[PDB]
Design a protein around this ligand. Structure first.
Ligand SMILES: [Cl-]
Ligand SMILES: [Cl-]
Ligand SMILES: [Cl-]
Ligand SMILES: [Mg+2]
Ligand code: NA
Length: 354
């Protein structure tokens, strides 16, 4: 039978000269078999949810550090590097941010003098969040997702920027302030990233490229691009992935794969197999081929790639299951990793360990 993850050679060791091997984690997963898999195979972690804005400051001046601290303590204890996800995002972000002093949404304000005041107030609240968070964790964090998903999937404006409440109120200044603030309190050696999904595909990739290129010209301290890599078996192509990483490397930036999962399905993910046992072996064999091709590319580009993080540990826990259920009437199971629900290795593991 396929051996347990702790009975085989380490991914971290295997890719030691190329890049860190990372996993997204939750506080309750830092023990038992998940703990055993992590220690054996990975030298980097990231919080799946515990370090998002709402997970850290649910109300103004009210900080909930426990989940994040637990993850940090596991990292210290096991010599793990640690990505911070994330300082700025349009989801999992508390409502109080975007309310004026009177308690009304800033987006409803029409008087321009007050719109300005709300803009400054929002940027000041953002600065305080980043200041407090960074000062607490700067000694442990080795990479910062400073902003997350600020580029749109389409072209609602000519710069391709996501028109979240952040944009509606501040334009792009929230992005500038995020990076400036991060740099100020984390120090010159901190690695600051802009993280996003579908970084391999146009036009989104070109809007990201342009944004980064424009901000760099104004001295905004961006060190790298986070490629979420929420990908599929045949999409995006290896060449699209290559081209994207080379473009950002050409601007003097680092690349990191931040949230890798290789879904068994398309987008949307229908049809989906209803259970894990119902997934045919041949799907896992196609996934393995894909994984071989992914990690040969990664290893080929290792001069411009410092870290590869999976968005989970093993197939028993993945946000791709939420997505599967969503598009298949509440029923569906994905299986994106190289370890199965019982922490036994999959074909994909053998194809990236060799
Ligand atoms: Cl809220
Ligand atoms: Cl192959
Ligand atoms: Cl095989
Ligand atoms: Mg291989
Ligand atoms: Na590297």
């Amino acid at each position: 039978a396929q051996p347990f993850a702790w009975q085989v050679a380490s991914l971290a060791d295997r890719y030691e000269e190329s890049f860190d091997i990372g996993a997204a984690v939750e506080p309750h997963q830092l023990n038992g078999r998940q703990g055993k898999v992590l220690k054996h195979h990975y030298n980097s972690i990231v919080a799946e949810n515990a370090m998002k804005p709402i997970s850290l400051q649910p109300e103004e001046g009210v900080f909930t550090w426990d989940g994040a601290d637990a993850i940090v303590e596991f990292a210290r204890k096991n010599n793990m590097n640690l990505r911070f996800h994330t300082l700025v995002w349009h989801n999992q972000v508390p409502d109080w941010f975007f309310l004026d002093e009177e308690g009304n949404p800033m987006v409803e304000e029409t008087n321009e003098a007050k719109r300005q005041a709300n803009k400054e107030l929002l940027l000041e609240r953002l600065e305080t969040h980043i200041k407090t968070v960074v000062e607490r964790y700067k000694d442990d964090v080795t990479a910062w997702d400073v902003v997350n998903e600020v580029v749109d999937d389409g072209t609602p404006n000519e710069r391709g920027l996501r028109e979240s409440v952040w944009y509606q109120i501040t334009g792009d200044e929230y992005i500038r302030v995020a990076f400036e603030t991060a740099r100020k309190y984390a120090g010159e050696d901190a690695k600051l990233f802009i993280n996003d999904y579908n970084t391999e595909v146009t036009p989104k990739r070109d809007h990201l490229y342009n944004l980064v290129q424009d901000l760099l010209a104004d001295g905004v301290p961006i060190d790298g691009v986070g490629h979420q890599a929420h990908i599929q078996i045949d999409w995006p192509t290896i060449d699209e992935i290559r081209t994207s990483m080379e473009m950002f490397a050409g601007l003097g930036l680092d690349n990191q794969v931040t949230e890798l999962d290789v879904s068994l399905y398309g987008w949307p993910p229908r049809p989906a197999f209803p259970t894990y046992d119902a997934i045919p072996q041949e799907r896992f064999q196609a996934q393995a081929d894909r994984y071989n091709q992914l990690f040969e590319l990664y290893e080929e580009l290792d001069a411009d790639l410092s870290s590869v993080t999976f968005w989970g540990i093993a197939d028993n826990h993945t946000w791709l299951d939420d997505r599967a259920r969503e598009y298949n009437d509440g029923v569906g199971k994905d299986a994106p990793f190289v370890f199965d629900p019982n922490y036994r290795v999959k074909p994909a593991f053998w194809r990236i360990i060799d």
